[PDB]
């Protein structure tokens, strides 16, 4: 529900972004990150205190992200 949302948001905000930047919650936007590293989404996914952290430089996506973008991209966000 959110993850391409959320993916779409990395790709065109170029990274870093929040969470309440983005429309979520700390632990939803976790999830997310989490969720897309495991599948292969997107790479660069650094862990800081605990949880993944987004920084200026990093976060690249993979040819399944970007090509899942094209399909899933039929949703109004931004």
């Known amino acids: 529900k959110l993850r391409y949302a959320i993916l ?3 790709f065109e905000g170029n990274t870093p972004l ?8 700390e632990d939803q936007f976790d999830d ?17 205190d605990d949880r993944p952290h987004l920084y200026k430089l990093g976060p690249e996506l993979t040819e399944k992200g970007e090509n ?5 991209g039929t949703w109004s966000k931004a």
């Not at 997310?32 to 800081?48: D, M, P, Q, T, W």
């Open 32 to 48: 997310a990150v989490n969720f897309l590293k495991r599948e292969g989404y997107i790479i660069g996914v650094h862990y800081s």
């Open 68 to 72: 899942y973008l094209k399909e899933n």
């Open 18 to 25: 929040s969470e309440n930047d983005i429309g979520v919650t």
């Open 8 to 10: 779409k948001e990395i």
